Design a protein around this motif. Sequence first.
Motif, PDB file in Angstrom:
ATOM      1  N   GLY A 166       0.708  -1.550   0.108  1.00 44.18           N
ATOM      2  CA  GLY A 166       0.020   0.516  -0.374  1.00 44.18           C
ATOM      3  C   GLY A 166       1.107   1.439  -0.198  1.00 44.18           C
ATOM      4  O   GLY A 166       1.859   1.347   0.520  1.00 44.18           O
ATOM      5  N   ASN A 225      -0.942   4.545  -0.136  1.00 44.64           N
ATOM      6  CA  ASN A 225      -1.772   5.688   0.528  1.00 44.64           C
ATOM      7  C   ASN A 225      -1.015   6.682   1.210  1.00 44.64           C
ATOM      8  O   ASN A 225      -0.785   7.118   1.558  1.00 44.64           O
ATOM      9  CB  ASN A 225      -2.476   5.307   1.049  1.00 44.64           C
ATOM     10  CG  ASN A 225      -2.409   4.280   2.286  1.00 44.64           C
ATOM     11  OD1 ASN A 225      -1.785   4.400   3.119  1.00 44.64           O
ATOM     12  ND2 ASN A 225      -3.657   3.603   3.479  1.00 44.64           N
ATOM     13  N   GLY A 249       2.438   6.917   3.109  1.00 49.97           N
ATOM     14  CA  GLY A 249       2.673   5.756   3.746  1.00 49.97           C
ATOM     15  C   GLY A 249       2.619   4.740   3.138  1.00 49.97           C
ATOM     16  O   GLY A 249       2.116   4.365   2.116  1.00 49.97           O
ATOM     17  N   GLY A 250       3.115   3.352   3.767  1.00 47.95           N
ATOM     18  CA  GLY A 250       3.350   2.370   3.017  1.00 47.95           C
ATOM     19  C   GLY A 250       4.456   1.860   3.150  1.00 47.95           C
ATOM     20  O   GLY A 250       5.180   2.783   2.086  1.00 47.95           O
TER      21      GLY A 250
END
Lengths: 130, 614, 112, 650
Positions: B532, B534, B572-573
């Motif tokens: 991810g 995001n 993030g991620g």
Amino acid sequence: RVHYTVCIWRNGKVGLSGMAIADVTLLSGFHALRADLEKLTSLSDRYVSHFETEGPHVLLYFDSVPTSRECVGFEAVQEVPVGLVQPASATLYDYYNPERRCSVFYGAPSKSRLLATLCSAEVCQCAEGK
Amino acid sequence: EILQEEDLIDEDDIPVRSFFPENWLWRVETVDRFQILTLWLPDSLTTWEIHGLSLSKTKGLCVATPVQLRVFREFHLHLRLPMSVRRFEQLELRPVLYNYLDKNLTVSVHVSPVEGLCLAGGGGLAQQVLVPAGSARPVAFSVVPTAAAAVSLKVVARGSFEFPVGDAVSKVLQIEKEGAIHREELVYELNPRGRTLEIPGNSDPNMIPDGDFNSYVRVTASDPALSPGGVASLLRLPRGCGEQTMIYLAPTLAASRYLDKTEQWSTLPPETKDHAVDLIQKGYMRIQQFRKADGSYAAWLSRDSSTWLTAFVLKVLSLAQEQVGGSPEKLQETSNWLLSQQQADGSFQDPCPVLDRSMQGGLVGNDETVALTAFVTIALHHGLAVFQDEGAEPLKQRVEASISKANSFLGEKASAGLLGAHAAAITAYALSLTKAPVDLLGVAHNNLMAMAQETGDNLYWQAPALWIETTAYALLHLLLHEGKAEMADQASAWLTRQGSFQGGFRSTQDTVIALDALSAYWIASHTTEERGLNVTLSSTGRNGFKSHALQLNNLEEELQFSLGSKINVKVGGNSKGTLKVLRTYNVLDMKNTTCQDLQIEVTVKGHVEYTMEA
Amino acid sequence: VQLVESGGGLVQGSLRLSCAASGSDFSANAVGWYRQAPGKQRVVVASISSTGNTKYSNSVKGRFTISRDNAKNTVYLQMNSLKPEDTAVYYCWLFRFGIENYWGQGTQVTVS
Amino acid sequence: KPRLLLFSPSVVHLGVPLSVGVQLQDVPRGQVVKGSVFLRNPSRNNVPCSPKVDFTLSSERDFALLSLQVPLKDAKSCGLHQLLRGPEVQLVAHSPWLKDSLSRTTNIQGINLLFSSRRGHLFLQTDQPIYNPGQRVRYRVFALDQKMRPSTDTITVMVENSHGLRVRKKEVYMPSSIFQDDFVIPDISEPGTWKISARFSDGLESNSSTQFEVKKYVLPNFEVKITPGKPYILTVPGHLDEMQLDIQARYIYGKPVQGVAYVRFGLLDEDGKKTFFRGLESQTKLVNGQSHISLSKAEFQDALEKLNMGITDLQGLRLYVAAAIIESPGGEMEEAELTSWYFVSSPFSLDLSKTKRHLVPGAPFLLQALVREMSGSPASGIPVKVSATVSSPGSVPEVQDIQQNTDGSGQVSIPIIIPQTISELQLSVSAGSPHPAIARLTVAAPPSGGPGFLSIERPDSRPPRVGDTLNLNLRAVGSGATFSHYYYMILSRGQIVFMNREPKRTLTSVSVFVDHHLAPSFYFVAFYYHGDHPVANSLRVDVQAGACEGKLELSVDGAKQYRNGESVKLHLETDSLALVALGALDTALYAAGSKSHKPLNMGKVFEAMNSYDLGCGPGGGDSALQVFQAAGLAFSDGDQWTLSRKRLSC
Ligand SMILES: *[C@@H]1O[C@H](CO)[C@@H](O)[C@H](O)[C@H]1NC(C)=O
Ligand SMILES: *[C@@H]1O[C@H](CO)[C@@H](O)[C@H](O)[C@H]1NC(C)=O
Ligand SMILES: *[C@@H]1O[C@H](CO)[C@@H](O)[C@H](O)[C@H]1NC(C)=O
Ligand SMILES: *[C@@H]1O[C@H](CO)[C@@H](O)[C@H](O)[C@H]1NC(C)=O
């Protein structure tokens, strides 16, 4: 009876590498005389290889357009009085890329090429009236 | 050469053609095997291509042949506006009159004096035109768009009373905002340091204050075994004494579980899978009846127990408990029995050595006590799962106390150094598996690295039973120790090569461990995370505070966001991608109105008649 | 649509000279009359637009009025001060949708 | 020595019933076999992935076709989505008869199957073929189950940007089977091609897409099309066919354009680079919207010499023809391009995609060839010559020559005779008179020493219409008559839709009724057993157009040349209650710059239904397993099984 004079030239050296297709539009209510238009294509040094005119529209195909101001003229006839005064238009295309147009506005002998528009820096108003 | 003094049809009489949809009859409707629906043809002269799809519950989809509806008017007016028109610039309109009738028409064409447009005469001045039968006559109209947003200009062509034919067309020309269109592409990067970044707010001077300000975000994810034949051949029906039965059962369980975890059961026919399961069931019962009263699992009932084989059997049965409906309490008792054999310092005795030492692997040698202690702890840990969550609470705690004592004892022995490769390998795996203290775990890891060997690419530690087993234990330790990093990949590659030889994995201790390591390695490599990425954008614009999100768990995404000033980013991620925010606005652009490469100049000389003049 | 007109006859003069239209949405469409004198081509004599804006041929403008009423779907061309050159055959003109033209049988009128 | 035989399509689609075939072989006639079939993934301790279905086939009626349900929830519970090494599920048959009577190592017998979540058919329709930035896009998607009946499952529609960037995603659960939604293209969007993709929510790779083009255009007033005299130009040495083409300009509403056509010529290579001619420009007035423009052989080669290209270099070049018609006195122009007009060495182009490989000795090898005119519709009455050279190992290679003419549909069926014990075969087929379009292929004979082969023969050799009943002649070749029945099955859209047996006789004829279930094509796998080994030979059978059963007939009140604003009456005729989804499109849009891609029609629908077909090739096989694999089947008779497919495509 009116006399026309359409002229063509190019800066050249890039962008065109071809010939042109003039699309001069006569003034409203005119029609180019067939005889004077044909004789352009009959000369030994004919400037336009092919032509076609119908009503106020004249399609002149110029085989070669040089950097000089070489050009030809013809004659038109009056069939109906022009109701209002305005500048007509003439367009020149590129044979191998008609997108490379060239639009120019030409007026009547005693008129101007643009409508009377008194324009300031940011806004403009027109004075088309008596 | 004559005019008409108001002998033309009324301007209001002729209908006005203003509705020009490129697509109109868009609807889904129910038909009871027959239906006629009336339509109102739009005021555009073309050939409509009407088509439909029938979606019935019984019959199904049934496409239909298009119906070429053709709408055409004998005498009409074709007004073709340009795609883009700039305000305060000369514009040329050429509404051509198409007369398909069999008569000659003299008509008056004039643009209605719509506000915001300056006509040539300043108003509704007529332009008489003679249209011969079956011919087109352009009627040029030069206008200058002075409006701000858009103007509806209608061209009315009312014919004479000789044949009263007329038509009018109403269109809206869209005058684009003054200034050109500019694009500001602001590329960036993304990562799990360097997390938060802020894109500076636009401060260019060329931007026109009053106008459009559209911004778009474009985030891109930008995402980057052993032969089933030999392993399957290891499936053999156990037979013989209490020891020889485990010789044939431990490889069988490992081969069955290796293929189970490696998902190589498809290659072999389905009969083999159930054949493997049936053999495991038979072997489970065969060894279960060798069990003594206290879960000793000796080679013979008369002969004394051996802690080595009890631990080996406990490990084997515990693993097979998942696919076999076994009885946990028997394993609980066996674990209890093992705890009894523990010595004072945390070692294990093994009072009666097994009859055959060939199955012991790299155990026979100068050092045995440390190997057994680590080996039993591995077996003991494997027995934690079989323990039931309900009841038998004291038994577990006694195990964690003993295994910790064994874990501690292993610490001094491993830290003492001068331990053999086999003892070091097992000790490292035992400490890592049982969650040994970090300091002891850390030293054991680096001690094993010291004894490591490297002779070439995909070489580490044909080969003797000791080297093959020791490598397998190290690979298990490395995989569980901060994952795999350029060494498990290289180390395991050797194991596959060594196992691919005809009749590979000579012994059983290596076979069970080696197949355990390779299966663990395979499942570790062939696994992916969410990835991810995001990102949330927030900015305090004129409208206030707004936020957005763009989940990129899988692709690429684009999103409209109304942020007119400096913006913030919150990435993030673990996945890393590309973010690029593009902003578009109108700038103060000027250029030649005249032609730059191809030029045409035309002039007119003579006398031209007129009707109304200033 | 069928156009029916009558009322033309010899007179010294004024003639009602009414015309009726066979329905087909008589209102909301222009209507008028055409003069067809002997020899020369058919020409407009008077017409009334849908909105009521009347137009007359400049030759005989302002002499005889034109009245259209929607009560019975008919038109009138009441004549007055007839001129000896007015002898002609008139036709009832309907003009629907802006491109469709219709004309009736046409009644002839004589002057003395 | 009985056998239990397990048949099933090589791929199981999650969420749709799976057709399985169980058939006994060599039963003592006095015992009835009972059992159950189910899907189980061995990777998760043989946890069943579908409810068990029992067959209970007996000796009097051994063949038994039974269907397995594969709900999505069962697949999730058994852990089919947690697999790491590709999708692979096992279909097994549990029957105690196996272990107790046949004395097998285990009472289980199964086949390895691939699985995919692809299911149902999604058809996306857009408002217009081409859009311009700032305009509103109206699109609707139709959801259909496997049987082509409307479905009511949840779908997710995601719109992709010209660069592949998603700009929309709407998870909509839809009970009407039609989902209408719209959006607005950004006003700044650069010209390009977008894409609307839709898929079932539970399914992950069951997507379907429709592309629409975004481009700044102004709706054209008239259409220009350049039609060459012949879509091909011969370039054989000596003879160079004259190049004449016709130019037509017509207003959209139907009337003929009256203008001037300015034409320029050039050559295109494979990639698309243009080499324009100079001095070859031809401009002519359009008389009734027509202008016959041709290049004399003399001036064409002169231009080639000027460009020094040379006649021989005209291998695969395309002769460009671009017009710039300017209607006069209108002033506007529209342009046509003629990229698709090649230089070829032969007018015809044989296609040998229907001639099955893997000849069978002792039976007449049927040769199928499609004589399609170069870049055009299939042609008729074109003699085709084939010279088969059977290579007998023990003698000189014999040469057989047989000639036949095209039947009339473009397809020719030439049966050649092949003797036994033939090493291989080489035949060259050439259709043309003169200028043959030669095409040749070699088919190797099956390995010797195996069981006799099975010869599937179709006497008709034409595509049957829906409702017909084609007859097939089965004949064992070079084997004893130990077997007493012929087993056959029919596959359509990757599903065994028919299984039966036919008794052996002197002339074994099987009547196959072709209903809508078998369209646009189906296979025909028939097998017989020579005691212990299986023998089989498939046959791919096409089907005719088979118009939809729905029978939607859009119609209008004749051709009255409706004026603008007139009230037309659209008649809708349907054979049952239905949801007619209408759209009226301006044909001027097709003229506007675009790929001119076809809209939704039966070509796409039948391609959609046949997209699920698992078989590849015209049929036939070297061995029984290969023919079962080719037909798209998984087979296992205990001692001989079929390996799982390596991929979802052949
Ligand atoms: C229209 O004008 C042309 C000009 O030559 C003439 O030939 C034609 O007869 C005219 N139309 C009618 C109906 O007379
Ligand atoms: C994405 O959102 C999730 C919550 O749904 C959370 O983990 C975090 O905010 C973002 N980053 C990752 C890696 O999930
Ligand atoms: C237009 O281009 C010409 C070059 O041919 C240049 O001389 C002229 O200044 C330009 N017009 C401007 C800058 O307004
Ligand atoms: C579905 O998506 C995949 C990858 O996103 C693509 O390869 C495939 O072609 C798509 N399906 C269809 C029918 O286009």
